């Protein structure tokens, strides 16, 4: 276990949050060149 898993997060979520942080912490120039190719548009449908 790890401090971020006791709640029950999957390592996918860990990487996702860390990546969002590293994205937020970039130059003002590279923000425009990194905000793209970073988001998500997929959405789920009830089964």
């Amino acid at each position: 276990v790890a401090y971020w898993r006791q709640a029950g997060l999957s390592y996918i979520r860990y990487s996702q949050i860390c990546a969002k942080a590293v994205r937020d912490a970039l130059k003002t120039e590279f923000k425009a060149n990194a905000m793209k190719t970073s988001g998500s548009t997929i959405k789920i449908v009830k089964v």
Binding site: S15, S40, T41, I42, K43
Partner: protein, 109 residues
Amino acid sequence: KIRSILHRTHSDQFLVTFKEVGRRPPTFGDASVIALELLNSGYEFDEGSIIFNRFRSVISYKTEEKPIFSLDTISSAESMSIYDDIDADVLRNYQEYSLANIIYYSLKE
């Protein structure tokens, strides 16, 4: 489209499906979303396959299938004996990441 083509036979076997694919280029965020919605769904799958269309060339593509496993298989796979620092924590975090990786690779192909 995949959901529809298989909603006559194999209609019941659906576990979850996603839309708005291909409208914009996929990203690792989309693969992470698919992996999350797979793991959270209380299905303890013991094996899996992913079918996609590998892009051979502008004229040809091949319907490829890549296998995927679960930490219960990796643990009991004797071939893993030669990898050190392998408990059931790093191994299955690595398995989650591997699932996301294969999903993203298939999305791009």
